[PDB]
Design a protein around this ligand. Structure first.
Ligand SMILES: CO[C@H]1O[C@H](CO)[C@@H](O)[C@H](O[C@H]2O[C@H](CO)[C@@H](O)[C@H](O)[C@@H]2O)[C@@H]1O
Ligand SMILES: CO[C@H]1O[C@H](CO)[C@@H](O)[C@H](O[C@H]2O[C@H](CO)[C@@H](O)[C@H](O)[C@@H]2O)[C@@H]1O
Ligand SMILES: *[C@@H]1O[C@H](CO)[C@@H](O)[C@H](O)[C@H]1NC(C)=O
Ligand SMILES: *[C@@H]1O[C@H](CO)[C@@H](O)[C@H](O)[C@H]1NC(C)=O
Ligand SMILES: [Ca+2]
Ligand SMILES: [Ca+2]
Ligand SMILES: [Mn+2]
Ligand SMILES: [Mn+2]
Lengths: 239, 239
């Protein structure tokens, strides 16, 4: 596979190219609802949902020292009745057989096991997190504010920028990887022009295997919110 | 899925996004060898191989009357010691669960069952065939010359154009579907400029289900040749 691209303007109840994990489901409004809701659509405690595209990405080739670039765009909104809604949504990249770790329903965002969430040698994941919950006695790795973070094999972000959750409002995001500069760049905006930018230098060939899957994860622990993925496009080329 | 694209500059022995059926395999020269070879690489009798991309294409949407377009490019060469090498290679589109029919190793090109190969109501397939074998007492549906054909639910092509097989030589092909004119167009060239063109009006929403897979099939019966797929790119958008 030397190039791969796909897009979801919205999400289809009869989709065939998504792997659904945990509580992820497609709503009647063509929204990918990652986390569990009750019969009235209200968010509930202790839930993880994830999606991965069924098509795998060749991120690099050992035999030839080629590396892929990628560009991905997505939009989402979060809703909750709580003053401290939790826990957040992340774009992520992981080995193709990745599954939801035990104990990941909460501040580990469906990406990490509590026993190894800070142990880089035990993980293989790149994530861009939109983290709404930062209580310092439970999310001890977090900054003391809502934030966007680039995560490399750890729930402790390598880089963060302060971010403002806006109840019910859509955030649009562009994430790119440049293999020649080994840079992940993140740009996120709200419709009124409020902008967030974050970057981190990481050689993805050192943290991920040759073939990966890409997708999204979200979770709630004892505090909760819906995590509503509205759209997603992805392009990759193996230079 | 509102758009899907992928490409193979050549073929990877460690590919992850191809469904291999029958004798299809990837050679040490990064060639997709569809049909069976012996230990010396020589083609053998009575073999079918097919590949399908693992990602499914939404060809149309019943709920919304949207229809996809697609453009696909590929190249292949055929090799054989015989005066009458057989049987040919086809690009095809079929339901996602499609498998090799029994008795398809020969002039049915790995696409049809002998009992229903001419019964349109029993099939769901669009194929563009490159047919090298036309003996009139066994391939009774064929023109009496080598040909490119557009096949709609039948091994008897809806449209044909005379074509010249060239031993060991690469043919480059572009196939497109225009949903507004419901036209399949085929253009094939050899490096010296020799050109072949063929088109056929067929409403794909009337012959194929909403979700399909795309790929290639080749077969040999009592006469034989290798069917060597060199490259393949595919793009589709659901307008
Ligand atoms: C009200 O819940 C907060 O206080 C509790 C007691 O200190 C914590 O157990 C609780 O942590 C869990 O919920 C959060 C938010 O969903 C989650 O981030 C964390 O991983 C735990 O699941 C929370 O701090
Ligand atoms: C020498 O084989 C030709 O003559 C035989 C006797 O008439 C046929 O059985 C034979 O047909 C089978 O092979 C061809 C070529 O591979 C294939 O197109 C056909 O479907 C049969 O498998 C062939 O005509
Ligand atoms: C980190 O994880 C690896 C693999 O599970 C393990 O060998 C190592 O001991 C762990 N480190 C700590 C400090 O637990
Ligand atoms: C064609 O196929 C259909 C479905 O298998 C069958 O009902 C029909 O009788 C077939 N026609 C003939 C002439 O065999
Ligand atoms: Ca957190
Ligand atoms: Ca034939
Ligand atoms: Mn965080
Ligand atoms: Mn024919």
């Amino acid at each position: 596979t030397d190039s791969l691209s796909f897009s979801f303007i919205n999400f289809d109840r009869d989709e065939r190219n998504l792997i659904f994990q945990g509580d992820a489901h497609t709503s009647r409004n063509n929204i990918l609802q990652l986390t569990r809701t009750d019969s009235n659509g209200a968010p509930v405690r202790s839930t993880v949902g994830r999606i991965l595209h069924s098509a795998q990405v060749r991120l690099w080739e050992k035999s030839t020292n080629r590396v892929a670039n990628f560009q991905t765009q997505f939009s989402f909104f979060l809703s909750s009745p709580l003053s401290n809604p939790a826990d957040g949504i992340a774009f992520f990249i992981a080995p193709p057989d990745t599954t939801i770790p035990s104990g990941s329903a909460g501040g580990l965002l469906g990406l990490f096991n509590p026993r190894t969430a800070l142990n880089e040698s035990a993980n293989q994941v790149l994530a861009v997190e939109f983290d709404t919950f930062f209580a310092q006695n439970s999310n001890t790795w977090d900054p003391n504010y809502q934030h966007i973070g680039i995560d490399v094999n750890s729930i402790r972000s390598s880089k963060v920028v302060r971010w403002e959750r806006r109840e019910g409002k859509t955030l649009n995001v562009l994430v790119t990887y440049n293999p020649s500069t080994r840079t992940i760049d993140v740009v996120a905006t709200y419709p009124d022009g409020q902008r967030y930018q974050l970057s981190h230098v990481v050689d993805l060939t050192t943290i991920l295997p040759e073939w990966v899957r890409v997708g999204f994860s979200a979770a709630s622990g004892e505090q909760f919110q819906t995590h509503n993925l509205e759209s997603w496009s992805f392009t990759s080329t193996l230079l």
